[PDB]
JSON list of C-alpha atoms in Angstrom, two decimals:
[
{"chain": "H", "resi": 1, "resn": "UNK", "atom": "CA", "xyz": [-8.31, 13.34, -17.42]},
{"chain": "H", "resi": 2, "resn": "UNK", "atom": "CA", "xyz": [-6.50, 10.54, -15.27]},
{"chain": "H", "resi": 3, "resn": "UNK", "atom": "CA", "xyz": [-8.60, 7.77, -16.92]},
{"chain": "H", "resi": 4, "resn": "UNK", "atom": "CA", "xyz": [-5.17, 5.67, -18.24]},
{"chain": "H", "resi": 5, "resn": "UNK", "atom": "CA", "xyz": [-2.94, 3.73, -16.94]},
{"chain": "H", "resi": 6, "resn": "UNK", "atom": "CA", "xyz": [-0.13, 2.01, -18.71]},
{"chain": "H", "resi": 7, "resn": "UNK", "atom": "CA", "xyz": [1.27, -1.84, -17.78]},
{"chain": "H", "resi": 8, "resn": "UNK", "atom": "CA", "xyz": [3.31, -5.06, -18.90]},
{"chain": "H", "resi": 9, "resn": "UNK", "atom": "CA", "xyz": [4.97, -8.10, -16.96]},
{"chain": "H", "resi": 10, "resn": "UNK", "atom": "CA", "xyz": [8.31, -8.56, -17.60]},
{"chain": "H", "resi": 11, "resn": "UNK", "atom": "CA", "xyz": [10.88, -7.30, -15.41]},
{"chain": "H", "resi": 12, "resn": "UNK", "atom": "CA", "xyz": [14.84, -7.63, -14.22]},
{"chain": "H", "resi": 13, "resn": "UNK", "atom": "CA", "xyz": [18.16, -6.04, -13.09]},
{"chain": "X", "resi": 1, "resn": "UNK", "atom": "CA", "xyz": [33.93, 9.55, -43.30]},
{"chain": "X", "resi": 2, "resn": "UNK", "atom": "CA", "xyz": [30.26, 8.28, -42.83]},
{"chain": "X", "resi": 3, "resn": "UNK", "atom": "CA", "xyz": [30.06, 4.74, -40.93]},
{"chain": "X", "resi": 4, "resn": "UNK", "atom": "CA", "xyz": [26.76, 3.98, -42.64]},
{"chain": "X", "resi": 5, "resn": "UNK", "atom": "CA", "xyz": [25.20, 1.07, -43.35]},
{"chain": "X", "resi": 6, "resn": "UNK", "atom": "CA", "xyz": [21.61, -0.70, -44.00]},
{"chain": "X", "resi": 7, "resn": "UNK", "atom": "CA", "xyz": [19.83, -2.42, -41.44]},
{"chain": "X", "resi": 8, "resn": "UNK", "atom": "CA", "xyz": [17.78, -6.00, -42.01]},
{"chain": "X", "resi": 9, "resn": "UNK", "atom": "CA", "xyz": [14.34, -5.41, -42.47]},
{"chain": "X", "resi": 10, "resn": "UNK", "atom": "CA", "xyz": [13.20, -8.02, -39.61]},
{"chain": "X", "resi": 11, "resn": "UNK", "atom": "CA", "xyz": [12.29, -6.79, -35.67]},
{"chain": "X", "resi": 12, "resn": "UNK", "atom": "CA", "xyz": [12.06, -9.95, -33.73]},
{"chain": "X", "resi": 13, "resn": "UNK", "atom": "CA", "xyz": [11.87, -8.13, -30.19]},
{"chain": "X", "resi": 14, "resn": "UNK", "atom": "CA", "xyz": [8.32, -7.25, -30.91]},
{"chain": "X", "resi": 15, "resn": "UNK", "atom": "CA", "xyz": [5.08, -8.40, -28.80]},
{"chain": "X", "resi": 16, "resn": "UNK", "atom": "CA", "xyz": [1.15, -7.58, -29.53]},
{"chain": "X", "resi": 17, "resn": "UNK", "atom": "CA", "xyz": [-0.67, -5.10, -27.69]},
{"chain": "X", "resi": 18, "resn": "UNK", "atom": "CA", "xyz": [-4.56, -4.86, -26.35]},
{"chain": "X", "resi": 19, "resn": "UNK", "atom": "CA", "xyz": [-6.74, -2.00, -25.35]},
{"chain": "X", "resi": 20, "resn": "UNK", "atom": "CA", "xyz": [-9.10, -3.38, -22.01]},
{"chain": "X", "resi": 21, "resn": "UNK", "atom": "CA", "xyz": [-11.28, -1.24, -19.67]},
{"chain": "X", "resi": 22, "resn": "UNK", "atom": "CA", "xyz": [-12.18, -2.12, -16.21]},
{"chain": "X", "resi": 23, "resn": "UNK", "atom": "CA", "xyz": [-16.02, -1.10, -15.69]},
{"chain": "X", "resi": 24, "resn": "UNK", "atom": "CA", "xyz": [-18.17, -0.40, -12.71]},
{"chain": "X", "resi": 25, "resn": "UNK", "atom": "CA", "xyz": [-21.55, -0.07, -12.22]},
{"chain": "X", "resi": 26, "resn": "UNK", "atom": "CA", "xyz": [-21.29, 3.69, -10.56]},
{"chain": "X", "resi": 27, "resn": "UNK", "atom": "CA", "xyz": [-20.09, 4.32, -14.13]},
{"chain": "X", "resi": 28, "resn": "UNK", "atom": "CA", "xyz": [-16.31, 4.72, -13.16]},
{"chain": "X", "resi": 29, "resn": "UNK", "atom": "CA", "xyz": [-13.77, 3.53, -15.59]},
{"chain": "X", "resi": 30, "resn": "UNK", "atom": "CA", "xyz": [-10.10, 3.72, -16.69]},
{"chain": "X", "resi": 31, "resn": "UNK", "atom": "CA", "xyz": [-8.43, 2.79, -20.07]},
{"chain": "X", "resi": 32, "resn": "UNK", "atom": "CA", "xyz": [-5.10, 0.60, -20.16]},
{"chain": "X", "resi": 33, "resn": "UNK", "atom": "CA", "xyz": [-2.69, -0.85, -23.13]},
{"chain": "X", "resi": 34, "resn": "UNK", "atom": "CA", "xyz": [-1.20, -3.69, -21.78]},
{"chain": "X", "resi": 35, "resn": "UNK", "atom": "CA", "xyz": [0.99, -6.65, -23.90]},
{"chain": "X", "resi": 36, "resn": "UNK", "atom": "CA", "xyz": [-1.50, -9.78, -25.06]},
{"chain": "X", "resi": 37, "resn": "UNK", "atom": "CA", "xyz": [0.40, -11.73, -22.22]},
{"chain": "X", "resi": 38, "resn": "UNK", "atom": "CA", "xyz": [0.13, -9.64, -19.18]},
{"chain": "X", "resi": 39, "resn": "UNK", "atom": "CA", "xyz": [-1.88, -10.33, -16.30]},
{"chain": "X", "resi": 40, "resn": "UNK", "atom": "CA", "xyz": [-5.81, -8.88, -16.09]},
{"chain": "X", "resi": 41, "resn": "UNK", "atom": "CA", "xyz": [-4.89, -8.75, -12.12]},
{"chain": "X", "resi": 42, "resn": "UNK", "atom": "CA", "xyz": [-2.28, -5.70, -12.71]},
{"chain": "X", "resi": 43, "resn": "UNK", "atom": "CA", "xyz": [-5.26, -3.89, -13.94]},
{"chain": "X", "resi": 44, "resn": "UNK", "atom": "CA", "xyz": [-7.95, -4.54, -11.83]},
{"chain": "X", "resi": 45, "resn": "UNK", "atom": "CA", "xyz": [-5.74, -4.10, -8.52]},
{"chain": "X", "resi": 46, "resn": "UNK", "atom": "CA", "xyz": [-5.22, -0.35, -10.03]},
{"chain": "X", "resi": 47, "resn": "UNK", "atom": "CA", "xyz": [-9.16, -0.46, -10.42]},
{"chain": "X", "resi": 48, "resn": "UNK", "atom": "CA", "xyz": [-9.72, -1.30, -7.24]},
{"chain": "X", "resi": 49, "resn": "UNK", "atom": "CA", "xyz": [-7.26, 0.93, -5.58]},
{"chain": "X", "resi": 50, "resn": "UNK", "atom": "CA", "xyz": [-8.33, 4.69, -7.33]},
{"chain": "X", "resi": 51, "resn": "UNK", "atom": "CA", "xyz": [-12.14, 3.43, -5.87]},
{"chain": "X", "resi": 52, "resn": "UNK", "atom": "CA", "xyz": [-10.26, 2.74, -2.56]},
{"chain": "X", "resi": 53, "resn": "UNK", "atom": "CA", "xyz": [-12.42, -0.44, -2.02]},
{"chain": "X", "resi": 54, "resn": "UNK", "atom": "CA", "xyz": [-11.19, -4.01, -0.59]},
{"chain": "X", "resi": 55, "resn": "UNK", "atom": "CA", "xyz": [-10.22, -6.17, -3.65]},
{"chain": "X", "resi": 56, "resn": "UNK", "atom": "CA", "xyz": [-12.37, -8.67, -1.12]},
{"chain": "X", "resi": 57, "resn": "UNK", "atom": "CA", "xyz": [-15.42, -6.53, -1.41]},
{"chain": "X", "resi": 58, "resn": "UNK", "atom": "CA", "xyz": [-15.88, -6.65, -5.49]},
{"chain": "X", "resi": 59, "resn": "UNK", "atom": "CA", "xyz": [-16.64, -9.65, -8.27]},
{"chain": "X", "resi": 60, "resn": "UNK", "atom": "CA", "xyz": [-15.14, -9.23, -11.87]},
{"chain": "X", "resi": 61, "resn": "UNK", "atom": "CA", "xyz": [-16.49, -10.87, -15.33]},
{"chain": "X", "resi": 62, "resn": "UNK", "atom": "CA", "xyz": [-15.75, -10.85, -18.96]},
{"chain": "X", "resi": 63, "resn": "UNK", "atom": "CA", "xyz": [-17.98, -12.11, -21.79]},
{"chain": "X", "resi": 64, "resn": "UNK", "atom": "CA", "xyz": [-20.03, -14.48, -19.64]},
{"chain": "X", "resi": 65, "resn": "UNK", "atom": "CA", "xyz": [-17.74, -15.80, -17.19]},
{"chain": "X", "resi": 66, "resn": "UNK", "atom": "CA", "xyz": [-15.25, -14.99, -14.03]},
{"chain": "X", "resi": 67, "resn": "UNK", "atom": "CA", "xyz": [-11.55, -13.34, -14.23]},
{"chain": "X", "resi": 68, "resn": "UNK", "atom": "CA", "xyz": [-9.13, -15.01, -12.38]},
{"chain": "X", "resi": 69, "resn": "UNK", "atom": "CA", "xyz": [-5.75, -13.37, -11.26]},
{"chain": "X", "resi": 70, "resn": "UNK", "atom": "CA", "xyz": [-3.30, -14.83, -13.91]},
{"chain": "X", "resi": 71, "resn": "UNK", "atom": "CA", "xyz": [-6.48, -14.84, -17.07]},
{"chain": "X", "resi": 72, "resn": "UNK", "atom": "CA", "xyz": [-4.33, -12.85, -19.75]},
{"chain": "X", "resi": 73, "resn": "UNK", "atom": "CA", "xyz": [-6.02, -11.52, -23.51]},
{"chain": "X", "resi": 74, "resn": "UNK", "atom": "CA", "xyz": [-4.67, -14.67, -24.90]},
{"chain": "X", "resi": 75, "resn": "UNK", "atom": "CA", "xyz": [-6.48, -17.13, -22.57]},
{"chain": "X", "resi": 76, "resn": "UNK", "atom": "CA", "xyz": [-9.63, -15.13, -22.49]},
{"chain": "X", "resi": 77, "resn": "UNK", "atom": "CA", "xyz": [-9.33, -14.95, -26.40]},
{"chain": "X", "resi": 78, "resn": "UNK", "atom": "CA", "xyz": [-9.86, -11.53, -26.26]},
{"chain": "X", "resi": 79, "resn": "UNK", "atom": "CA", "xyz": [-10.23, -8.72, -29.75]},
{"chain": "X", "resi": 80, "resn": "UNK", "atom": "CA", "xyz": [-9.43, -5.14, -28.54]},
{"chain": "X", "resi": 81, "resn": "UNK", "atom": "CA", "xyz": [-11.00, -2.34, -27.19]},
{"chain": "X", "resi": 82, "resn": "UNK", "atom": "CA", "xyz": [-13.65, -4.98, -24.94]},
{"chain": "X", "resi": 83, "resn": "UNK", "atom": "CA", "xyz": [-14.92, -3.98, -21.64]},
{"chain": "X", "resi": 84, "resn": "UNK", "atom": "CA", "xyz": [-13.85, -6.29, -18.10]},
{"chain": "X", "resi": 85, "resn": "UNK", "atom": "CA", "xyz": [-16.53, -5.06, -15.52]},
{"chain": "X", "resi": 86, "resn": "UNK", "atom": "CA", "xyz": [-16.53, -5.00, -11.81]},
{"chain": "X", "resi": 87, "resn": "UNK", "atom": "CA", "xyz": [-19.56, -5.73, -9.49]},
{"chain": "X", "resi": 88, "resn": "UNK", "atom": "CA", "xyz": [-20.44, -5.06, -5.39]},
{"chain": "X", "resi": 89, "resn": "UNK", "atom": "CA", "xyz": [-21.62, -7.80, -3.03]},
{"chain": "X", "resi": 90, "resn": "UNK", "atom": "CA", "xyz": [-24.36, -7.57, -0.15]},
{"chain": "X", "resi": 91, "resn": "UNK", "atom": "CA", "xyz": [-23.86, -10.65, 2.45]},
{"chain": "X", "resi": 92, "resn": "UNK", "atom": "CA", "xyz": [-25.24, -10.10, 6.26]},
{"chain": "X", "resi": 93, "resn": "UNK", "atom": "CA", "xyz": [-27.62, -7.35, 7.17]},
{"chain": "X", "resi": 94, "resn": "UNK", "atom": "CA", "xyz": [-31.36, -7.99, 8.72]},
{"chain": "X", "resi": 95, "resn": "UNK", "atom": "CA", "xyz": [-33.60, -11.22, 7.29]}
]
């Protein structure tokens, strides 16, 4: 059900 | 009184995204939607994690060759929906 996973590389305050 | 107006029909904030797997020979798998930049290493850390292995303990490989950790769908030249799988290692033991 769990099979997902979402992800990028940009990141700031 | 209505403060409408049109908008330009250009988005230049937009990026591509890929669909990639991460494989294993137990038949274990998860699906991710990353951007055509990001690193294959945020994925296959996650891998390696939910199968609570060492990231020491594992090989990974894509369309003949090795996956570094900074390889992104651009400089693998990757379509979507492909397959990255993962593979065990057996060093020591009797001889």
């Amino acid at each position: 059900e769990d099979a997902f996973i979402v992800i990028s590389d940009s990141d700031g305050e | 009184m209505a403060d409408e107006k049109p908008k330009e029909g250009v988005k230049t904030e937009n990026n591509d995204h890929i669909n990639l797997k991460v494989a294993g020979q137990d038949g274990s798998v998860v699906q991710f939607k990353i951007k055509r930049h990001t690193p294959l290493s945020k994925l296959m850390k996650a891998y390696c994690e939910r199968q609570g292995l060492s990231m020491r303990q594992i090989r990974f490989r894509f369309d003949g060759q090795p996956i570094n950790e900074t390889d992104t769908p651009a400089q693998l030249e990757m379509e979507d929906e492909d397959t990255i799988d993962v593979f065990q290692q057996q060093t020591g033991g009797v001889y």
